[model samples]
Target chain A: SDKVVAIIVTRLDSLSENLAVQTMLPAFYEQGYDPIMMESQFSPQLVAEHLGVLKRRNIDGVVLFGFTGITEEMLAHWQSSLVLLARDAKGFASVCYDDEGAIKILMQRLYDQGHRNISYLGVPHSDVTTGKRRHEAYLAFCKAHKLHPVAALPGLAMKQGYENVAKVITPETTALLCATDTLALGASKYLQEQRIDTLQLASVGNTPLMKFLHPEIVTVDPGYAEAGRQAACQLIAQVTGRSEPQQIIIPATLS
Target chain B: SDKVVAIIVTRLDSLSENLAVQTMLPAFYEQGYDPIMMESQFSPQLVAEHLGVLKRRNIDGVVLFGFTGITEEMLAHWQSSLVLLARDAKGFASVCYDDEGAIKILMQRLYDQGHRNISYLGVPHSDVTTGKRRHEAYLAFCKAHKLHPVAALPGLAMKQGYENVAKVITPETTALLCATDTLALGASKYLQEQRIDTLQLASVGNTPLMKFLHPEIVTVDPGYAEAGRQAACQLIAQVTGRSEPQQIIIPATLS
Candidate 1:
């Protein structure tokens, strides 16, 4: 069938997305599909260029990840079926991370530890999944528990995490919930370097490196491997005309 | 010219090697070459199969990485020019890390810190560059300085680092040197979790993740990006017939 699938990730340098891609590549290969990786770096023009290439190559399926410029009109012209990761567009098949569920689990854990006042390190809502969904979830969780949503949305970066945590954290704040592990890492450094061990550290994205360094940090695994496998499965099923476009949500776990 | 360069890395999941491949891809792309990734998993048979695919596709050139089973006889039948990363072949253009020099610098740093008795966390000498070259360098450095060589050779795993350091570390040991950041991570956990802060931690591979976690730990940057760029440059040069096969060694710096 000369089965070829193209996986396009918006941010190539992102460690979190790379973890998903790492798993997705093998899943496609194991399923007898030749997977080709394309990096868009969140550029709309680049995504267009890649789509053109896929069309020219007659690729069987595609998986778009963490992209914002996607539109129904744009995807309508695409020849083959495709699956989305972490983003949904106009009935397109997608495998989404359970961002709200992750926040709920993390917050519950923090609450169980007798921490009432929890601060959040997150990105602005305009920035997509890591930026939008997770941040919104944290806000919703704070509302649900009638807790003050003390958050510092200073974009994503370790430096931002360090600086924001330094400024926003108060003596009453017993724990910090980060939207991502990278930010949590910054918080970890700030807490450690400053010798502020009183505050508990909690975040999402249970990266091995982060866990290895700070084993005690309360974190959540976003189930990257499962999301990748599910995306691949959905794409293959759609490409084979065996199923319709489906939406699968991969749940996060406390790690 | 199709300008399709196949990059076959030995271990796809390795964080260290992936750092190199990350840079190599963009470098090739910026030079108008289409870089395709292939994972060999350090298997000789898999490499052979990939080589056959490259030949069939008329791939312009290739960059082989950390492969031990490559022979002059095996490459003789290959139609395209190629470059090696870390592992050198008979007159093949290659880019290698300064493994011994990295150890030299790391040991000198420890020596300056008044550490006379140093312990090593390394892999068996039979396991290729990280295993062979770095371990040998540590041994030579200890002999030259007339310091006691207290070492643990526990394959390459964070758990092994934790277990070995737990068992082998003595109060007399002033410093611990690791062959990789991964091992250092294990050691960091052991030291932190066990509440033993007297022994200074040092290691190779200044991974961003590691540095973020343990910023105080002395580490050496093996210049992964430089090595990758140099490998791409060497391969492009050979593929274009503009130069002879040359060996390039990328130096490491204390980070």
Candidate 2:
């Protein structure tokens, strides 16, 4: 088939998400369209550049992996350019998960587990959009529960999480809820090191390798495979002139 | 001048590296070119697709941010495609600090501090290539010093690191050399929590935020700014045809 769809990702080192992309690629290819995947680390400018490149390559549609602040700008540019490219060109479509819904589900689970004194650790304030949304959702959840939410220094690796947890956690703290499993793992380490026996820890994503360690972590399974399928379906719709260009959010679940 | 460059990154949520790119973008624009930057999140196939996009866009050069297992096939594709795009294009250029050298310095410092029996908490074998190298170097250094190197579970996060430390650390373990500060923080937390007074802990990267936390972690300063500057310079060089394509290693220091 002449139809070519591109998948643009921000960071691919995220093992679980990358695995999802890998699984989806073959599925997309089997559907009779060539799937082109691109990653932009975290630079908005790079995302824009890649979109422009996709335009020149005459890619029929695009599926952006993670939500970076660059998406809105890139979509605008792509839509405008495609409008000028061909008479019936409708431009690229985007598929994203409901981060707020995911957080809400996870927060409800944590609260039900009696995790009242909770703290969140992950990306810092300056991060583009997703981090802010999650952080805000956390705060909102805490407020709804009539509890004060503590914030741990956002660290990427286990070491930083450990350090941040060690320094920030107090005697009253019962649980540490991390934005990512990587961060949660770090916090768990800190609690263990501090010999804080009373604390319970959890992360948001249920990554496979994380289960290798005992005391299975409580996390939200975002149904990444389903998200990929949705993204592919959306892109196909756009290509087939069945849908308009917009953001589609797939639902998530706490597992 | 219209010069396009591609950036392939491993993870997007990594704040430090993302900030590094943010700081470098304006500098590229200031140099008087339409600097087109594309990010590849860490998938080899995605990297290939982005390379194709760069080629289609007639991008001037390419710059990879993190080392994500550059497979032989990827190298072959880059060599054939990118090598032809820019007159100055080298096979691939990366901005890595002298981690081995920094670890050596760290070993010397720890050894001088009267720490002969040390334990290491590292990232999982699958997570990082650099971590594996550091572990190997640590073992060699231990053998040379006539000291026993105790290996902790590959702690991918603080919690895992803490758990590994708790399970392995004996009263005889005097120091814990973590793969990174995040892990070190976890180790330190474990010691403090357990009231294990026999261990001193340190990490590899001297993240500025580490200083704020108590116990003030001792670490190696990898000069992230310098790495950023060098990466930008290398990309510019590849674009401007002013330097040879070769791996440039920036030296790190014990902080």
Candidate 3:
């Protein structure tokens, strides 16, 4: 039996996706599954077409790389087609970071550090899941601690992010909890340039470079590699008919 | 005749896109046109379905919001359908920042400020026209200035961005030219955290927040509002058959 698994990712050049696929490939191979990685420029049409190719190639299973919302129709079509073809297409699976978990851990750590006034550098309110969930968590945490939680900036990217923090953050803001390490870096930089002393600043997503940087940004490792590993395992199980069509939320931890 | 314009945007919650649409909507209405903003949620199938609805509704034109790549086949279909309906939809138009022009100005300014060694921080090379153009301009600028350019980290979020910059940048790198204001903020933060004296740091896209931060990040204003205006104008012209199919390049300036 030719048990080949096809992995379709958004972008091959993206460091995060690249690291994810690279980490999963060896793991898949170890499971006696021939893994083929395909980079789809995040185009649904391309992804669909690639899925068609995989079907024709008789790939035993498929795993989508990232969690950008795919159309329900596309997902249904892919699922139906895989079922029709009897190729164990096990629906789509993705490795997601524990965004909410990270926020909870960061808040706990900041609270433990005795930082009462914590300003959260968040993405915009309109952002799906991450931004909204993190903001909600921040508010809840602050209320629970009986502290004033000021939102510095509620948007992504460097330009607005910097300004948002500058507008709301004051000398009294002892600790800043950023939605991501990138935002934390931006806020910290702006404060430093202004010669402001911030007691503590932390972010999520413990990428490799964060460890090397000075001030050693404290972050929660969402175990992205392990997430990738689990995704592969689920995909393989589906291919082998060891599981049914169901949603599997791989357990995540705050490191 | 009622002209319905279809909008394909990456994420509806994106403030920049919302801002662009807000600016474009009033401009279109002022010109005596009905402008309907359809959010595609970044799905090509949704794009196709929206096109179907526009067809049934006798839509006259379309203006895609974000910078996602569309295949030639889809472009051909879109162009043909609009033509068949006696409407103009020949060329797909997108509103993006002028990275090349901005980087050019930033490089010159840094050179004038007695900073010779400059580094660049960017997201991973993912076939995004904006990122590609910026990288090209950076290389060209470095070659013209006879400066050795060092590459910093490439990641989507700011946290990874900061970590990458902190690791690759050193005292020798006096300036950092970021691909986006987001990356610039992250890199600047990392450098500041390390106590590395940066003579100049800048980015493209003069978002609302860059000026308030310390060191006052110099930025290039890509005229997003103007781009929105042009997109509206072009969409109207196409629908009314008042203009031919053409690619309009909006010029950008440094601020």
Candidate 4:
């Protein structure tokens, strides 16, 4: 049986997306199927075109990566050949990373490190996983631990981190937790420039490049590859008619 | 035709590998074919196993990425369905990046910037492209420009860069040219910690993370995505009998 699965991912520039795709490749290959990867970059038109392309080529299934807002048009066009990674839709298979747990883990690590006053620098809750889930988790962690939550919900760029790190960090703050590596890096640059050795930095997304640059920074590994593996398994089962739509959560690890 | 192509790449964790795979995704899909990616991690056993998997699955063609040492077993087992990227073998279609040109461009830029004493930090010439080609080009560039060559090729890690920057740099050395971004990053760390405001940094591999972190370093984009596109085209031509074996070089761009 010659069969193919399509993987439609957004954000090719992202390290997380690359990790997921990298892991998914071997998973499908090991299971005796070929997977073709396509980039929609979260564009609706490109997604539609790729679906058409996959259908015309007779590809059996697809793994859609990281779309926060699911649309009716997408659901109507999307039939049996679909599994979502880091996202969810009604009546569809999905493997989501533990966004909330990732933030909580980082917060716990910082708390254990004797950092009572931990500040947070993150983007606004415009998107789901990186935005609302992780942001909400940080709030919940602070509340649970009975600590003062000093946070700044700035924009997404590294410059935003630099701009807001100065605004958020008080003398009592021992550490800073970031929502994403980009923000962490921004904050990291600020820390380096100012020679502030008293403050420790932590963030989500344990990218190799980020680790290489700032080895001292504590970060969380969101288990991107594991999510990919799970998505592949779910999509394989669906395409082969062995399973129905299911939800799986990939746990985060402290890096 | 519903034809499938396999892409076997080494170093899945590297930024360059991700960029190439990301671009190759769209190129294959746009050509009305499916491309399955596999990671060999430069292990002979993994390469052999992936090849076996592709053969058993009846994948029509393949793109082999960055094998400095090509084996006889690989060539013998690999027949009409093959194209090499960033490395070449006899009678096989290959696409290579402009490693020499990339170094030369960086050197020229440094020279134009009025940096007379530019020291180098890189890995030993164990591998072909990053090692010998770039190193040889830097030597050639120095000789042609009638400048003294001060270099340190200790190893491939960032620590090497930190350890050697003090040894290679002099008061007259205004810039340090690195073989790869990892080296540049190590050098950057040392520079920041030491408060070495006199020296500037340059390197190959214009990764986004690198750029975002160190906006001042001069780097060259080896055109990883463009090379992927060219490789896909070459492999497609070979698999469909549209052409004979040929070699293509992807040029470097400054970033």
DockQ of every predicted complex: 0.31, 0.09, 0.03, 0.24
True contact recovery of candidate 4: 0.20
- Model 2 chain A: ten consecutive residues of lowest lDDT: A80-89
lDDT of 1 by residue, A1-255 (tens): 356787787654577887887788778878887666667777777677677756755668888885667777767765248898898876788899888899889999998888889998899877777778887888887888888878888877888898788876887988899999889888878888898988888989998767777778899999988888889888988888898988888988987
CAPRI quality band, candidate 2: incorrect
Clashes of 3: 9
- lDDT measured at residue B44 in model 1 versus the true structure, 0 to 100: 82
lDDT of 3 by residue, A1-255 (tens): 445576665543233444455556667768876554454554667666666655654557767754344455665645522221101124544345555666778888878878888888888655544577778888888888899878854565655565677765766878777786657656766776687765577776665534545345667765656666767766666666785554444343554
Cα lDDT listed for each candidate = 0.81, 0.62, 0.61, 0.81
Give Cα distance to truth, residue A148, candidate 1, Å. 1.7
In candidate 2, which residue ranges exceed 4 Å CA deviation? A1-54, A64-225, A240-249, B9-57, B64-96, B120-140, B143-145, B149-171, B179-197, B207-217
Tens-digit lDDT track for model 2 on B1-255? 245455444444443455455545566566643433343455667666666655655656555554444564655645422322101224665556666787788888999989888887776555444466778878889989999878864654656776677755766888878877767656665676677765777787676435545345668876666666666676677656786555656687866
The better-scoring model by TM-score among 1 and 3 is 1
TM-score of each: 0.91, 0.61, 0.51, 0.74
Error of 4 at A133 (Å): 1.9
Off by over 4 Å in 1: A1-3, A11-13, A72-79, B73-79
Compose the digit string of candidate 4's lDDT tens values, residues B118-217. Answer: 9988777887788888888989999999999998887677778878888888878999999988888888888878888888899999987678778889
Cα RMSD, each candidate? 2.6, 7.8, 11.6, 5.2
Q: Candidate 4, residues A1-255: lDDT per residue as tens digits?
A: 456677777765567788888878888888877665666766777677667756765667888875655564665655566888888777778898888889988998998889889998987787777778888898898898888888888867778888899888888899999998889888987887898988889988897767877889999999987888888888888877899889898889998
Residues B103-199, model 1: lDDT tens digits: 9999999999899988999988877788888888988988988988888889788878988887558778888999899888887888888899888
